[PDB]
Amino acid sequence: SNIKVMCRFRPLNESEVNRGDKYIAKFQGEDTVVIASKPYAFDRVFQSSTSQEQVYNDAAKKIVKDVLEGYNGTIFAYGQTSSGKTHTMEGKLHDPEGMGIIPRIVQDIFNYIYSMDENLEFHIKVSYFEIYLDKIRDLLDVSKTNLSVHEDKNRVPYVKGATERFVSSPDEVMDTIDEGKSNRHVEHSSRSHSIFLINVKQENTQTEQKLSGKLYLVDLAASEKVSKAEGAVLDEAKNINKSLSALGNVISALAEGSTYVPYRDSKMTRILQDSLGGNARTTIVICCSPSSYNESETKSTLLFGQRAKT
């Protein structure tokens, strides 16, 4: 099973306890979470006590290993405001124990590269864009709005004109991430799906053997609650739910072995076709707050976790 849905719970804020929130989550086995006598089964459920290194080892380590062998992988991140999503995916970048998934990914990639002999010429290309209101905006080039998706000789879709920078250090990769996040069209989150690609290219010298691993880190926009029709929030809601539904359809099709996988339903699932198909490894991580004050938000996140796969 190479398609995985994992759910991570977080510890309560101290202000949450001072506010008076009861722990509403019960845990069965290693993969079931019960919220008010309703059980939700996934591939893995990290309880509040599990560490960042554990989350990384269970969710992303094998995807990094595969991308270092020429294969592709994608990691989706979903979660309401203050559900720990940013803590899971980024964390305290400078704390080795409390750093999230992306710094660990970059660190393992470069630590691998520095352990190989130079008979393998390595290169790393980064790319960053966002689908906002169903428009592909390049996060590394603010003038590159409305990017098209095309198909090459081998029929694979690709985002024509997306900026790709060579990077040479984990510091440079996280700098690119900070720049891209700052270029978004605007902890309360934006209303767009951001997509960050790391491309490990490697040539073996005399055999002229070329391998190209693509690792996609996708930050999804969450389907939120109805809130008081002012501005662009309704447009955002329609587009976000359309894209999340298409993504769910494609993950279901690929998790069950469908001949008729609907990559053409949305743009995101056409960009990620070559990385989701081909028996590749995808791990959708959803973050939940166990507070009673976030019962509805957590229910929505859990139901999206179920709608994703099978």
UniProtKB/Swiss-Prot annotation:
Its main location: cytoplasm. Composed of three structural domains: a large globular N-terminal domain which is responsible for the motor activity of kinesin (it hydrolyzes ATP and binds microtubule), a central alpha-helical coiled coil domain that mediates the heavy chain dimerization; and a small globular C-terminal domain which interacts with other proteins (such as the kinesin light chains), vesicles and membranous organelles. GO terms for cellular component: axon cytoplasm; centriolar satellite; ciliary rootlet; cytolytic granule membrane; cytoplasm; cytosol; dendrite cytoplasm; kinesin complex. GO terms for biological process: anterograde axonal protein transport; anterograde dendritic transport of neurotransmitter receptor complex; anterograde neuronal dense core vesicle transport; axon guidance; cellular response to type II interferon; centrosome localization; cytoplasm organization; lysosome localization. Oligomer composed of two heavy chains and two light chains. Interacts with GRIP1 and PPP1R42. Interacts with SYBU. Interacts with JAKMIP1. Interacts with PLEKHM2. Interacts with ECPAS. Interacts with ZFYVE27. Found in a complex with OGT, RHOT1, RHOT2 and TRAK1. Interacts with APP (via cytoplasmic domain). The keyword Coiled coil applies. Residues 2-310 form the Kinesin motor domain. ATP binds at residues 79-86. Keywords: Acetylation, ATP-binding, Coiled coil, Cytoplasm, Cytoskeleton, Isopeptide bond, Lysosome, Membrane, Methylation, Microtubule, Motor protein, Nucleotide-binding, Phosphoprotein, Ubl conjugation. There is a cross-link at residue 201 (Glycyl lysine isopeptide (Lys-Gly) (interchain with G-Cter in SUMO2)). It comes from the Eukaryota. Belongs to the TRAFAC class myosin-kinesin ATPase superfamily. Kinesin family. Kinesin subfamily. Microtubule-dependent motor required for normal distribution of mitochondria and lysosomes. Can induce formation of neurite-like membrane protrusions in non-neuronal cells in a ZFYVE27-dependent manner. Regulates centrosome and nuclear positioning during mitotic entry. During the G2 phase of the cell cycle in a BICD2-dependent manner, antagonizes dynein function and drives the separation of nuclei and centrosomes. Required for anterograde axonal transportation of MAPK8IP3/JIP3 which is essential for MAPK8IP3/JIP3 function in axon elongation. It is found in: Cytoplasm, Cytoskeleton; Cytolytic granule membrane; Lysosome membrane. This is Kinesin-1 heavy chain. The gene is KIF5B. GO terms for molecular function: ATP binding; ATP hydrolysis activity; cadherin binding; identical protein binding; microtubule binding; microtubule motor activity; plus-end-directed microtubule motor activity; protein-containing complex binding.
